[PDB]
Amino acid sequence: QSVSRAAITAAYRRPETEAVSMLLEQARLPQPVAEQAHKLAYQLADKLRNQKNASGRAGMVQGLLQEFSLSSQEGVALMCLAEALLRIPDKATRDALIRDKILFVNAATWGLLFASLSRSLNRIIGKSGEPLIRKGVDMAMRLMGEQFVTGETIAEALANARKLEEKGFRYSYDMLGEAALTAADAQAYMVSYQQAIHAIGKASNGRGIYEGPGISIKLSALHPRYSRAQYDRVMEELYPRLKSLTLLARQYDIGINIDAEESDRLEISLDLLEKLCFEPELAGWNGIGFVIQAYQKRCPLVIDYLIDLATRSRRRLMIRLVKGAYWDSEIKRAQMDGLEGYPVYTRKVYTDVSYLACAKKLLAVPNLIYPQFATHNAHTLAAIYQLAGQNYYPGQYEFQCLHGMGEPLYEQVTGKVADGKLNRPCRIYAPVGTHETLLAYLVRRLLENGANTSFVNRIADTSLPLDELVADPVTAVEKLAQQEGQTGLPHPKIPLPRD
């Protein structure tokens, strides 16, 4: 192994105290930068929460819960009466009714401002059995999944691109589908990716890899049973498909991004990337993209490897820095394999520290890397905005977000400074497909949106103060260290697998 590759292997399951301790000073924002990041993060998060005046309205609500000393159920019933009184057309009639004589239809709506289904479920299940549950799972998947899908076909998705592209957004299209089980499956995914590249490239129409749309692909879609595939067959069979797609993307001058999947496939994806970057037909072209996951202990070591690879292959790599989408499965997998540790962090704040440390490493080498900072977290965004320094230029970096999740944050970000935006570009990850391809992606979105550790979940909790929401992760880690006795202890509820 090379020096940078050997270091990656050594860090695979590095103990968490050691890994967090090493990243802390690399992630620490200088005090004036930290202060600017805090103010911007607070600002962004405030406008998020309080679009349509969510907090101010809630404030006026609780204020009247005090003056009259009433309960929540008491307040709602009062509003229903108040609403019915305001529907009396003439004020003299309304006042005379209040003075002399002294319904809940919209009580549910007012309640938003302030059991027997188990019987129906037990009854329905026993009668209809597994085929019923199977349809309900399919129906729920489609209904919850619609918000995350941009179109059923690439033509439909592309036809919708102008609205946000004219506001300064960019796109990366993903033909949904992954973990091909059979040779036919992987062949179908290959054809779907090829069709998409032709369509995206014609829409791009020469706009290039920065301003114009690109495509995102999953290696597991291009090789049957990728999860256990051996190096020899991957190089013989997957790599020609990856090369073919990348050459076609180059002909249209669109970016082609290799998504990151489960941690035990990191090594083989680096081998594929290494071979790809030295193809003569890709010489002098900078459209190859690659995702790295900051929740992995190997991430900073992968960056050192990628920096060396960009130098040796004489290109600028497009690198999407993410936290990671597979955390729940990674924990379970490691616990089942009984190894020495985890390949991912076990406290969410450590992943945040890793992301900031990695972001600094990426921003330091603008000749070698175009960083693409994927996040829906207002603090993460504000930190990167300050860490990138004075004198932004469009080709320095971009943000990225998922369709159906990013819009309210990035509406403050992409666009003109005169319109109150930050004037930084954001590329929207745009899934494309029908219900038959949606399941795995939707499940990962449910885990992301439903976790009480997720920014998108915490910002919707109006009982959590803004300052806690955008708290600096390095300071959070030091506070834990002072309380617990050392830096970087694992999550108390996630012991090592051999325990």
Stretch that binds ligand FAD, among 124-132, 161-169, 271-279, 291-299 (CB under 6 A): 291-299
Q: Is 325 in the site for ligand FAD (CB under 6 A)?
A: yes
The residue whose two tokens read 């932004």 is 392
Q: Is 293 in the site for ligand FAD (CB under 6 A)?
A: yes
Of the two residues 186 and 459, which places its CB atom closer to ligand FAD in the complex? 459
List alpha helices for 183-293, DSSP H.
183-204, 208-211, 231-233, 239-252, 266-277
CA dist 391 to 388, 395, 413, Å? 9, 12, 16
Instruction: Go through 380-417 and write b for each residue having 16 or more CB atoms within 10 A of its CB, e for each that does not.
Output: bbbbbbbbbeeeeeeeebbbbbbbbbbeebbbbbbbee
Cα separation, 76 vs 110, in Å, equals: 6
Q: Is 148 in the site for ligand FAD (CB under 6 A)?
A: no
CB of 218 to ligand FAD, least distance (A): 8
Name 23's Cβ contacts closer than 8 Å, sequence gap at least 6.
300, 353, 354, 357
Stretch that binds ligand FAD, among 116-124, 205-213, 361-369, 445-453 (CB under 6 A): 445-453
CB of 312 to ligand FAD, least distance (A): 24
Q: Is 300 in the site for ligand FAD (CB under 6 A)?
A: no
Of the two residues 62 and 453, which places its CB atom closer to ligand FAD in the complex? 453
Give the pairing type, strands 256-258 and 398-402: unpaired
493 backbone dihedrals φ, ψ, rounded to 5°: -95, 5
Beta strands in 140-192 (DSSP E): 170-175
- How many residues bind ligand FAD (CB under 6 A)? The answer is 33
Q: Is 348 in the site for ligand FAD (CB under 6 A)?
A: yes
Pick the binder of ligand FAD from 150, 220, 296, 351 (CB under 6 A).
Answer: 351
Q: Is 422 in the site for ligand FAD (CB under 6 A)?
A: no
Of the two residues 79 and 356, which places its CB atom closer to ligand FAD in the complex? 356
Cα separation, 384 vs 324, in Å, equals: 17
CB of 63 to ligand FAD, least distance (A): 32
Give the pairing type, strands 426-432 and 170-175: parallel
What crossing angle do the helices spanning 348-363 and 299-313 adopt, rounded to 10°?
Answer: 20
Q: Is 327 in the site for ligand FAD (CB under 6 A)?
A: yes
- Which helix or strand (DSSP H or E) is residue 66 part of? helix 54-67
Do 204 and 254 form a contact (C-beta atoms < 8 A)? yes
Of the two residues 27 and 260, which places its CB atom closer to ligand FAD in the complex? 260
Of the two residues 448 and 472, which places its CB atom closer to ligand FAD in the complex? 448
Cα separation, 384 vs 403, in Å, equals: 21
Look at residue 374 and give its three-state secondary structure: strand
The residue whose two tokens read 């004489």 is 314
Of the two residues 415 and 490, which places its CB atom closer to ligand FAD in the complex? 490
489 DSSP assignment: P
Pick the binder of ligand FAD from 104, 114, 239, 326 (CB under 6 A).
Answer: 326
Of the two residues 207 and 491, which places its CB atom closer to ligand FAD in the complex? 491
CB of 454 to ligand FAD, least distance (A): 4
Q: Is 380 in the site for ligand FAD (CB under 6 A)?
A: yes
Amino acid type, 245: L
Q: Is 8 in the site for ligand FAD (CB under 6 A)?
A: no
CB of 343 to ligand FAD, least distance (A): 11
Q: Is 346 in the site for ligand FAD (CB under 6 A)?
A: yes
Q: Is 246 in the site for ligand FAD (CB under 6 A)?
A: no
Cα separation, 427 vs 213, in Å, equals: 8
CB of 461 to ligand FAD, least distance (A): 13
Q: Is 324 in the site for ligand FAD (CB under 6 A)?
A: yes
Pick the binder of ligand FAD from 203, 429, 442, 477 (CB under 6 A).
Answer: 429
Q: Is 374 in the site for ligand FAD (CB under 6 A)?
A: yes
Stretch that binds ligand FAD, among 74-82, 187-195, 246-254, 346-354 (CB under 6 A): 346-354
Pick the binder of ligand FAD from 259, 330, 398, 472 (CB under 6 A).
Answer: 259
Amino acid type, 10: A
With CA atoms as reference, report the closest residue to 346 among 11, 15, 10: 15
24: left (phi over 0), alpha (psi -120 to 50) or beta: alpha
With CA atoms as reference, report the closest residue to 146 among 434, 448, 454: 434
Interacting positions 459-498 with ligand FAD (CB under 6 A): 491
Q: Is 345 in the site for ligand FAD (CB under 6 A)?
A: yes
With CA atoms as reference, report the closest residue to 203 among 161, 150, 246: 161
Instruction: Go through 62-82 and write b for each residue having 16 or more CB atoms within 10 A of its CB, e for each that does not.
Output: eeeeeeeeeeeeebbbebbee
Q: Is 329 in the site for ligand FAD (CB under 6 A)?
A: no
Q: Is 401 in the site for ligand FAD (CB under 6 A)?
A: yes
Q: Is 291 in the site for ligand FAD (CB under 6 A)?
A: yes
494: left (phi over 0), alpha (psi -120 to 50) or beta: beta
Q: Is 296 in the site for ligand FAD (CB under 6 A)?
A: no
Stretch that binds ligand FAD, among 29-37, 129-137, 289-297, 433-441 (CB under 6 A): 289-297
Positions touching ligand FAD (CB under 6 A) are 259-260, 291, 293, 295, 320, 322-327, 345-348, 350-351, 374-377, 380, 400-402, 429, 448, 451, 453-455, 491
